[PDB]
Write a protein that binds this DNA or RNA. Sequence first.
RNA 1: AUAAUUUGACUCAA
RNA 2: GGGUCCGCCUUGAGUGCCCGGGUGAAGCAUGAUCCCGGGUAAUUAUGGCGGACCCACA
Lengths: 53, 121, 329
Amino acid sequence: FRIRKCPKCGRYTLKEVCPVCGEKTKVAHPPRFSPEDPYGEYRRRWKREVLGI
Amino acid sequence: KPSYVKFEVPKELAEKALQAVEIARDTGKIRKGTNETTKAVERGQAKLVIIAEDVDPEEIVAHLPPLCEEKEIPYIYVPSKKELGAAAGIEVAAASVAIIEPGKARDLVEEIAMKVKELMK
Amino acid sequence: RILPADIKREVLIKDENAETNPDWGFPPEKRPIEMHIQFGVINLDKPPGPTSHEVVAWIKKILNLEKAGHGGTLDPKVSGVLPVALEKATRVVQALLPAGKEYVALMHLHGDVPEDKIIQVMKEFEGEIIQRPPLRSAVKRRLRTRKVYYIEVLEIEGRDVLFRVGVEAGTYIRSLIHHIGLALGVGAHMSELRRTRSGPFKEDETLITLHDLVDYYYFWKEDGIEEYFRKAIQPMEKAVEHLPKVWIKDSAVAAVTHGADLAVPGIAKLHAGIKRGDLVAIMTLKDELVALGKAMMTSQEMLEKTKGIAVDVEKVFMPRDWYPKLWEK
RNA sequence: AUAAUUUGACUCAA
RNA sequence: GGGUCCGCCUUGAGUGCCCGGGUGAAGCAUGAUCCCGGGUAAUUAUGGCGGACCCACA
Ligand SMILES: [Mg+2]
Ligand SMILES: [Mg+2]
Ligand SMILES: [Mg+2]
Ligand SMILES: [Mg+2]
Ligand SMILES: [Mg+2]
Ligand SMILES: [Zn+2]
């Protein structure tokens, strides 16, 4: 994927550094999801630590 | 650094991890790419898991640290997925790699495993 | 750079003395989590891969819902804003499906074109365009007019053109890009597409991926933490933000939920600029969605008159027992 | 059931 | 008689695509290729049929 989005100002760009605010941009599209979600237990273990649960 | 990076890896140790992948690529056995790497871990085949620090979105590799900890498999971080892909012998980036047989990197993987253990605590 | 959903209306006060009783009804804030889901809409960030229809099927299965529907079909390879109305809120999509949309697109040109020429020609596509739905479509393949509200070129890297576009519902961006290529002579195709706006829904803190949606669900289900999943679901009132509103008295609410049309003496407040035949949202003075309807009067007619049917009630969303029966013989 | 709508669907058999 | 609310007015099989498992190689390990399995939404209007409420100028 080529479309990137700045996490700071929300600018859509193809650049790795945002042309508006200079922040490092991220890929605009969400990762693949599966209803089977075989590694959900392990992703949630990471997420709980990040969120503080 | 992304939230899936649980500890700070010194430059020297990260370079040894890439060295171990290159050597195991040539003399042993590796799995490259996150699906291959994940299966190697869950099947209990991985000796060492190498994870890139610039994976976006984080969800591609976020399950790997908790999975490795559950399976008692050491893991290490390297700064660059393109560099990890290159070390694994492919033309594209690799978000993660598993060393199955270290080959001539036997002692190197043992050293890395010792150094990550003290970083974990 | 603005859609019809951005244009704001003035509030006209018909009855200044009209107040609401805090003991009746369930405003979004007072809804228990189970009730919140029943009258909820998810601002989903669709992943590339599955069709929009499959995604809704997945949501139904994982969240254990009997009913759900989306506010407009995004193609398999397309990501972004997909409003998913749930359960008792499912029918609110009728306000979403014909609403204006915004996209961010990547166009690949098949030849070399100067940057000023690209900007110039793409500006010519703003306004009415004539399209026929492609061989792969869910609607009748007849010539039809669609409105392009704005096009903004963000950046150009050689043959790759990144642009934002605001369109009328049912405008085919792949076809639009194809005709831009023809106007530039060299030809073009769409390589990447993301929806950034769908009616009142946009890229804010309420936009949620399937990963976060299901994780927050299990944080509630299995961890017993309601807060994350609550914020994952929007009240059905959100799906109505872009519509003109009539605010009604407590004593008119139960009547409307029991099948009565809305008469003039029941109106407390209303938005200006309502025309006859317009789709309006009937709201309580607590900003609960009661019903959708068609205006039988203009804004000025509703305000000035004392008798007559103001709104023909068509779709009732509020349960009958939220407000007591306050009407007379 | 019939006709439509939504940026994604199509064919065949009772 | 009218209005609102709920349900129904086919089911299979297959193609496509996707997802999981297995495999793990311009583009491509954030997954090429092939095998196996599974999945694939609603809304509106009109009419018909079964049911639930109400007939309300607030
Ligand atoms: Mg697969
Ligand atoms: Mg075959
Ligand atoms: Mg198949
Ligand atoms: Mg009947
Ligand atoms: Mg009965
Ligand atoms: Zn920025």
